[PDB]
Amino acid sequence: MTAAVKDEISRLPVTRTCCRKAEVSSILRFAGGLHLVSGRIVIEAELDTAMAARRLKRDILEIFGHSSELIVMAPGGLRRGSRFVVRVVAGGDQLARQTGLVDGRGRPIRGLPPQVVSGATCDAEAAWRGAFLAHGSLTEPGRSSSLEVTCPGPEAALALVGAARRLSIAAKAREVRGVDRVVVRDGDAIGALLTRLGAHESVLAWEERRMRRE
Amino acid sequence: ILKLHHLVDDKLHARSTGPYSMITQQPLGGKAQFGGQRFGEMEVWALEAYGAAYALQELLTIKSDDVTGRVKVYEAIVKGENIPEPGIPESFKVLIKEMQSLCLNVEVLSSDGMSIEMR
Amino acid sequence: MTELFQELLVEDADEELGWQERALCAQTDPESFFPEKGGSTREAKKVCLACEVRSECLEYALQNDERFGIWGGLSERERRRLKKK
Amino acid sequence: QKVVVDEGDRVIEGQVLADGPATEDGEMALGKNLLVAFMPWEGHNYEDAIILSQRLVQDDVLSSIHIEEHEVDARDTKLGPEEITRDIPNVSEEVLADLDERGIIRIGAEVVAGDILVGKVTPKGETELTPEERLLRAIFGEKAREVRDTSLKVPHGEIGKIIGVRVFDREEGDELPPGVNQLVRVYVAQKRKITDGDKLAGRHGNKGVISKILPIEDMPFLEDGTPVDIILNPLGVPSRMNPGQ
Amino acid sequence: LIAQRPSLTEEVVDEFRSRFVIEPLEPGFGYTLGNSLRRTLLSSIPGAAVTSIRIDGVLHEFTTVPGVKEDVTDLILNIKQLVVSSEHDEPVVMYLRKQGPGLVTAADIAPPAGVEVHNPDLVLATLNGKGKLEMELTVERGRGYVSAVQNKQVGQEIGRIPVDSIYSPVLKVTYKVEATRVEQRTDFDKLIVDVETKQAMRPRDAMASAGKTLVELFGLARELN
Amino acid sequence: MLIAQRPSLTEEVVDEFRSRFVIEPLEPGFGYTLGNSLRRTLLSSIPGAAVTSIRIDGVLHEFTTVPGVKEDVTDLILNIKQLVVSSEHDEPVVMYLRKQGPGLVTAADIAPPAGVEVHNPDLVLATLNGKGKLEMELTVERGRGYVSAVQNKQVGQEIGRIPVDSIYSPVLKVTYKVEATRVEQRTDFDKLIVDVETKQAMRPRDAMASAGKTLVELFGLARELNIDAEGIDMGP
Amino acid sequence: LSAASFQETTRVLTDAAINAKSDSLIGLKENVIIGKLIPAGTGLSRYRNIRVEPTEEAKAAM
Amino acid sequence: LTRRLVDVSQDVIIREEDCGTERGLKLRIAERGADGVLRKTDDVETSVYARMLAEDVVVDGKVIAPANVDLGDVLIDALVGAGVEEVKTRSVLTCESAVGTCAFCYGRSLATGKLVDIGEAVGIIAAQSIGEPGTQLTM
Amino acid sequence: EGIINPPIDELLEATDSKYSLVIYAAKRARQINAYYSQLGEGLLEYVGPLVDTHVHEKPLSIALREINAGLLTSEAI
Amino acid sequence: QLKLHQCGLPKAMALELFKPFVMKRLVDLNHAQNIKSAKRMVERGRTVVYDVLEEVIAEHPVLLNRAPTLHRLGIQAFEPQLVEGKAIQIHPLVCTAFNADFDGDQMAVHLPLSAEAQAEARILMLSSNNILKPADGRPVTMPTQDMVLGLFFLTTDGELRDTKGEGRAFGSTAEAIMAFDAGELALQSQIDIRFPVGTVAPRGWVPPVTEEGEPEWQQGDSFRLRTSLGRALFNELLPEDYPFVDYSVGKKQLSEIVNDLAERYPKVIVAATLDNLKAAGFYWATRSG
Numbered sequence A: 001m002t003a004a005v006k007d008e009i010s011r012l013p014v015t016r017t018c019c020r021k022a023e024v025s026s027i028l029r030f031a032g033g034l035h036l037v038s039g040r041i042v043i044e045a046e047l048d049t050a051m052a053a054r055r056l057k058r059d060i061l062e063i064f065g066h067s068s069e070l071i072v073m074a075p076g077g078l079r080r081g082s083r084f085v086v087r088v089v090a091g092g093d094q095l096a097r098q099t100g101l102v103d104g105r106g107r108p109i110r111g112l113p114p115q116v117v118s119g120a121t122c123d124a125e126a127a128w129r130g131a132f133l134a135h136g137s138l139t140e141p142g143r144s145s146s147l148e149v150t151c152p153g154p155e156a157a158l159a160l161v162g163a164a165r166r167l168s169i170a171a172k173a174r175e176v177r178g179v180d181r182v183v184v185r186d187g188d189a190i191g192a193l194l195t196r197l198g199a200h201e202s203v204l205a206w207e208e209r210r211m212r213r214e
Numbered sequence B: 001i002l003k004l005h006h007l008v009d010d011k012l013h014a015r016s017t018g019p020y021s022m023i024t025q026q027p028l029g030g031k032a033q034f035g036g037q038r039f040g041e042m043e044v045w046a047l048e049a050y051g052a053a054y055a056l057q058e059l060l061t062i063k064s065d066d067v068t069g070r071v072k073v074y075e076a077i078v079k080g081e082n083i084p085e086p087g088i089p090e091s092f093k094v095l096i097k098e099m100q101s102l103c104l105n106v107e108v109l110s111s112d113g114m115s116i117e118m119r
Numbered sequence C: 001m002t003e004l005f006q007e008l009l010v011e012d013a014d015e016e017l018g019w020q021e022r023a024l025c026a027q028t029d030p031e032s033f034f035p036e037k038g039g040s041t042r043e044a045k046k047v048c049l050a051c052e053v054r055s056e057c058l059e060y061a062l063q064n065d066e067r068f069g070i071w072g073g074l075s076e077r078e079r080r081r082l083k084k085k
Numbered sequence D: 001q002k003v004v005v006d007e008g009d010r011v012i013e014g015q016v017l018a019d020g021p022a023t024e025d026g027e028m029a030l031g032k033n034l035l036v037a038f039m040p041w042e043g044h045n046y047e048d049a050i051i052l053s054q055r056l057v058q059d060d061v062l063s064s065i066h067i068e069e070h071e072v073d074a075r076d077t078k079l080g081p082e083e084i085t086r087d088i089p090n091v092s093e094e095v096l097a098d099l100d101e102r103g104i105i106r107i108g109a110e111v112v113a114g115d116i117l118v119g120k121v122t123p124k125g126e127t128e129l130t131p132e133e134r135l136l137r138a139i140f141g142e143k144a145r146e147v148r149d150t151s152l153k154v155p156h157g158e159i160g161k162i163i164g165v166r167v168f169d170r171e172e173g174d175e176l177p178p179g180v181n182q183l184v185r186v187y188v189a190q191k192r193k194i195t196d197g198d199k200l201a202g203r204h205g206n207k208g209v210i211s212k213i214l215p216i217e218d219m220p221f222l223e224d225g226t227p228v229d230i231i232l233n234p235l236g237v238p239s240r241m242n243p244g245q
Numbered sequence E: 001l002i003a004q005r006p007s008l009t010e011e012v013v014d015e016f017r018s019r020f021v022i023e024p025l026e027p028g029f030g031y032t033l034g035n036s037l038r039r040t041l042l043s044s045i046p047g048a049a050v051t052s053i054r055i056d057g058v059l060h061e062f063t064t065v066p067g068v069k070e071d072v073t074d075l076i077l078n079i080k081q082l083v084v085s086s087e088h089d090e091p092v093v094m095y096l097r098k099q100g101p102g103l104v105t106a107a108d109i110a111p112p113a114g115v116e117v118h119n120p121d122l123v124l125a126t127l128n129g130k131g132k133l134e135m136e137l138t139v140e141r142g143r144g145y146v147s148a149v150q151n152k153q154v155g156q157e158i159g160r161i162p163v164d165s166i167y168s169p170v171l172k173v174t175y176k177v178e179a180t181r182v183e184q185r186t187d188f189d190k191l192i193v194d195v196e197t198k199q200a201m202r203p204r205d206a207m208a209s210a211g212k213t214l215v216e217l218f219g220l221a222r223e224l225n
Numbered sequence F: 001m002l003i004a005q006r007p008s009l010t011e012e013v014v015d016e017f018r019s020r021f022v023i024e025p026l027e028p029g030f031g032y033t034l035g036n037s038l039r040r041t042l043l044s045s046i047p048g049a050a051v052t053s054i055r056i057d058g059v060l061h062e063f064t065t066v067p068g069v070k071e072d073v074t075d076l077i078l079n080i081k082q083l084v085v086s087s088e089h090d091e092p093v094v095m096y097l098r099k100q101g102p103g104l105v106t107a108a109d110i111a112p113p114a115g116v117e118v119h120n121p122d123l124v125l126a127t128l129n130g131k132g133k134l135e136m137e138l139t140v141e142r143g144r145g146y147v148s149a150v151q152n153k154q155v156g157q158e159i160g161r162i163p164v165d166s167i168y169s170p171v172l173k174v175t176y177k178v179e180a181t182r183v184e185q186r187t188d189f190d191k192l193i194v195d196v197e198t199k200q201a202m203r204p205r206d207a208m209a210s211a212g213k214t215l216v217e218l219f220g221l222a223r224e225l226n227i228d229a230e231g232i233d234m235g236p
Numbered sequence G: 001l002s003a004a005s006f007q008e009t010t011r012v013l014t015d016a017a018i019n020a021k022s023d024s025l026i027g028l029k030e031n032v033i034i035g036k037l038i039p040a041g042t043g044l045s046r047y048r049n050i051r052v053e054p055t056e057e058a059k060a061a062m
Numbered sequence H: 001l002t003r004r005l006v007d008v009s010q011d012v013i014i015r016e017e018d019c020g021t022e023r024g025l026k027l028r029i030a031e032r033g034a035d036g037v038l039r040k041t042d043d044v045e046t047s048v049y050a051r052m053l054a055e056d057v058v059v060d061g062k063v064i065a066p067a068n069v070d071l072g073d074v075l076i077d078a079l080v081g082a083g084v085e086e087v088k089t090r091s092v093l094t095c096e097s098a099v100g101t102c103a104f105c106y107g108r109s110l111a112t113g114k115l116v117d118i119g120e121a122v123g124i125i126a127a128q129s130i131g132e133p134g135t136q137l138t139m
Numbered sequence I: 001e002g003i004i005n006p007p008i009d010e011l012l013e014a015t016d017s018k019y020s021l022v023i024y025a026a027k028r029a030r031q032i033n034a035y036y037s038q039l040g041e042g043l044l045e046y047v048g049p050l051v052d053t054h055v056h057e058k059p060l061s062i063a064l065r066e067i068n069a070g071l072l073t074s075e076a077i
Numbered sequence J: 001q002l003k004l005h006q007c008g009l010p011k012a013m014a015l016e017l018f019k020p021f022v023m024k025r026l027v028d029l030n031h032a033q034n035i036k037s038a039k040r041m042v043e044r045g046r047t048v049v050y051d052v053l054e055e056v057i058a059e060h061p062v063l064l065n066r067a068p069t070l071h072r073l074g075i076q077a078f079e080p081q082l083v084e085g086k087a088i089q090i091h092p093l094v095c096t097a098f099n100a101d102f103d104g105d106q107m108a109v110h111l112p113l114s115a116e117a118q119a120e121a122r123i124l125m126l127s128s129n130n131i132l133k134p135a136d137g138r139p140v141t142m143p144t145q146d147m148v149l150g151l152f153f154l155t156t157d158g159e160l161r162d163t164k165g166e167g168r169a170f171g172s173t174a175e176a177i178m179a180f181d182a183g184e185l186a187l188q189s190q191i192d193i194r195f196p197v198g199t200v201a202p203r204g205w206v207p208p209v210t211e212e213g214e215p216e217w218q219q220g221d222s223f224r225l226r227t228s229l230g231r232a233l234f235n236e237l238l239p240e241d242y243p244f245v246d247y248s249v250g251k252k253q254l255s256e257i258v259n260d261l262a263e264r265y266p267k268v269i270v271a272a273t274l275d276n277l278k279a280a281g282f283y284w285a286t287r288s289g
């Protein structure tokens, strides 16, 4: 359902440096976290996609200059979902401070880094791409996909809504059962958004499926 | 054993950009300012003997006299791109003006015999 | 969880320009704070509710007297009545 | 100048009561007595270089105090007189923390390159501003104070304490030159220990720059365990024809 | 083929000087062990020392106080030789108060419970009839030498004067490798290490600390399997 | 106190019997504190076995030449020296070399008794020509380090017993050096590189382990003076 | 130009003015003075007129 | 002195590979001794080494040394053994190059032990080499 | 490793002299740097690098490596 | 400790020369938001700035010069590395080229910018490519003092020395070193040493050991040579293909050997051999007595 979509997004080549930085920051913020162990900060990011973890590791090594481990052992323990976990221990504090998770010698930033916000539209769509790669789903249970992506806390969700607005694409933040996400319902916005992210074959398949079924 | 008044603290200085002189636009000299190290005749002869033409050209033009080239070089370095081509030093223009003030009709020609006017 | 022991003890900046840098809305869509047409003023109010420099933002806004947007978790007429009271 | 006599001692005419800059008990003393061995050591004293010990840094055997003085004056200009004040136009209060009520740095306060010693402001007058800066000012609503800052800052690569400040005011009967309204001098002192790159010498024309400072535990030591304090190269003695050393 | 193993015995020359005899070692092996022990003793023996002072009416080192015969800079050099021993992990404070004429001997320092000053005959300053010395000293723990710019804290007051710290209980170490030809039908050695400490600990404790430091490195060497 | 940065040891293998160990990051100093001691204990503090004397039949202590053998006596002694053997009996034990006829006499033709083994039977000892005979007796015993030729114990004991130098230590060559390693924090931290080359019997790793054990015991000897003495603790 | 920069500048200049001499800029000193590439070493036209492109195989591989 | 020397001979640079000239200097080697046995001359390391041969040397109807060779120590030893005294080498003093000089007549470059390149600046090197040791000559 | 590599003799085996090698390597380095600078744009101009590089490697080192490997040609215009 | 192509710069000088490059790099890694903050951070001397400087400075040659520049070897290109202090570290071998003494001399450092300038300073002016002197062609980059002494003490005859051994035969150089460690052998006593197949026999070496029906090759044959341990140790510094030296090495012999190496071998091997000779010379000069 979404495996092909995320594969296509991961396989998309990227050139501009700022967009790569924004994508890395988004994925780290959404599907990543920090742990203060043995007196040092270690960054752990959990992905459930084959190529996405490699892409994130390569981006870190290239732009931020750091090394990762890329372990395949499942934190869930099932070992069937291939819950990849990429780790950064050497220079973890520097990576955290220079990627936007923590700034001002203070608490972790709830929303997306200020650098990602108030940037070019390319960086906004790159941040949305990273958010979709990290977490999200494409359900199509009934009449609409419900292209929902969950976020930690209202701040990240509303920041994603704001970023989507800059693309002239409708979006809506929602909260249920204490967990909040951003969703877009109408088919036209879904198609335009998926086209902008870079996926092509999945966009077509969805287009014909919707037109034939509806 | 005695301790001489030649401490290294007062001997070290370095520069990348600083004040410039008024008449000729070369870097200022000394250590109270930032100051630039001199590149005299003998060093020019050494570089000529090596066969290094591009290094000599950049030392003599975009580091001392090329007024519009210094800022362009700094911008190119900061933005991470190719260093531009050197121009024509200001000292040569000052020399031409000084000779012209002596009623000497100096003029630089092109491949054909037409003056360039030096801007 | 990932709280870094409340900012931890590893810091090298030791320099702060002002209370602008501690603004939470900077991590958030600026446009939502200036409701055009009719708009709404509750989601951004909730966002401001968690701001750590809400008092400073309100004080600066009142002193400079901006008559647009929502500052310190309050909108234009709340500021106006506070000024008139 | 140190003191030599005691509270009860009797002094005759011409006797010494206080030493000088480089005298010890009334007789010249320009250096120190160091235990020296002549031998080439691993190439660290190659071609006139010198190897020292760490004991000469621990015990301040070759430490010296150096002092420097900085001057700044406030005078008259076309657009009124310059002023020495603490109200620098646009700087954080953290910079203006050690300054006194008169805008002059406080005695006993350590400084590093970039700090301001005297806060001075000179009026500049109305000037035209580029459109971008005008738009920035409009956004931030700031106002040009009409005065720029010309404070006195310590040079690059300088450090030390503050020993004293001396201020002359033209209106206080001081004989300042014509056109100068106020003057101030600040004295900065620091103690320097011996470090490599410094030049040492003896009384027989044998000089050299310290190029190494070894720990105490890896200097050659005599049969009873006394390390040597300085290692010199024998090759320099015979060719230079100074067997006096 | 030789079954005899080394052994170490102690001899006391005086209160603070000892001679340790190790024998019978393999030939050509005494010098290396002696030098390893000497380096460890002269490098990595922990102690304590004064790391800062502040006087009542002083702002910096380059000044003098009324009623004393010496500058502050020439008093820092006198208190740098204090041989103190502390048992507290955190910094501790001591007070020195003297009034009237005489000598401010190191015994006049009143230390809290936990620390001690071991040379109570050191002469710090001399006071005349119109001088009073009120000074506060700070004591910490460590090993080696700290150059008084590591002792500078972030929130230093104008009145706090950092001072060089020398944590080293050992004073002079040497060794002699007697080629005694210990009668074992072959050649052997006899190492004799002479240790003198500066009246802060006894040489046995210094040797024990050196051995404890040296055993760990060869411990991580032997775990190679 | 606390070390605050635990040094670690790593190995590299060059040949079957050559290794390069790196210990880093050591504190300032401490590169020469345990470098020369490591070298000395590796070279002369590890047991082994070796030949001590020979008795070639028909040749006295004169080394003019060996009849029937192409190589001279010095070459024979040098060839014998390169032999690597292992033993178990404290007393010296004698084995017989009985090769005969033209051809090549190698170490594979020896007849060691029980408890003694030869770890390189393919070693070349000499060449025989003209239907010559080579009869030899080799005495092997245990020891430590390198001991030069034990001179005549008894002048009148016999005529032909030639003593030889004995190389007991499995380790043949050792070297070391120290360098600066740290970049991030203050530099001058030491890194120690030790190059080890042993013979065919033992591996460098075992030699390093034995050296570590010996030095640990030797310095625990001194540590026993006062067990409750504060040193440089390490943690893990 | 070179003669003037060597020594006796006044005499050289007043002799060159009358003859209306023209300098062709072939030496090293003149090119150094006016600030261009000396005609020696890497400043020759034999070396500086070239074209650098990858081989077809190298481009195909990547 | 060095300033003057550099100025007189600044515009001397190599500009060819070979001028084809057959002219050369007659340089002597292997001065005859009083014993009747040829012995290599003392000043040959700075007179004939690093210098090509203008014309081929023929002795006993052979080619002892082919033309245009570096003329190192091996060739000189062979020539002395064969019984030769004078050789016609190539020098800048007899160069017919229409443009400047040529690499073959100059010879080997002493600073790199290979034939001088077509862009080398030999005049400045000569001036510097002559002028550098002037601070050791007693005045 | 560093300025020493690749060995100068191996490079000179691929060219005529040092003077031509300087220009050849410098031109290739300028091409690589120009390609890197305008990588953000979607452009078809300049090519390379043709070898495996590091995170931030000087373009001159890469140019010399390609020259040594024999992945370039020089013509006369 | 430096190599022939390296120099040590104080970090203050390095940070001042490389200010624009450092600013660009630490804006690129996101350590700074813009140029203004990057310049402020560089000027105030933070911690990350030096970590970035130590990697921007890599593979960027600098031209070192000493006035007066009497010949073209007075300017040379070195690879810089950061050191702690305020004085420049210079290799001991290049001093004779600069005519540099360590009695308080000063030197100047220049930084090439463009790709052509870097290519020239890296291919034409490099320090490990200028062994020979342009005036006469004899090497100037050669061990001069305290290294000639060490190599002379190592390789010399025991006329009045206390030569222990003097008749022993060893199966290798390792065994000779093991005997030397114990007080059994001298560095100058004459002994017979057997060498492996790889070594090349000395030039001359008129006898391949007399035999009948068994030849020998110039390389790949084990031979016994009567020499001192010092010469055996000295021959481990020269390349693998160089013939055994076997004679006392003063300063003329060392000049001959260095000239032969420069004439017959590539430049990297010559530089490595010079570094080996320097290290051995210092080591054995300290213990010379």
Ligand code: SF4
Binding pocket: C023, C024, C025, C026, C047, C048, C051, C052, C053, C054, C057, C058, C070, C071, C072, C073
């Ligand atoms: S209170 Fe002010 S600073 Fe804080 S989030 Fe609201 S608008 Fe921003």
Ligand SMILES: [Mg+2]
Binding pocket: J100, J101, J102, J103, J104, J105
């Ligand atoms: Mg000198």
Ligand SMILES: [Zn+2]
Binding pocket: H018, H019, H020, H021, H094, H095, H096, H097, H101, H102, H103, H104, H105, H106
């Ligand atoms: Zn010609």
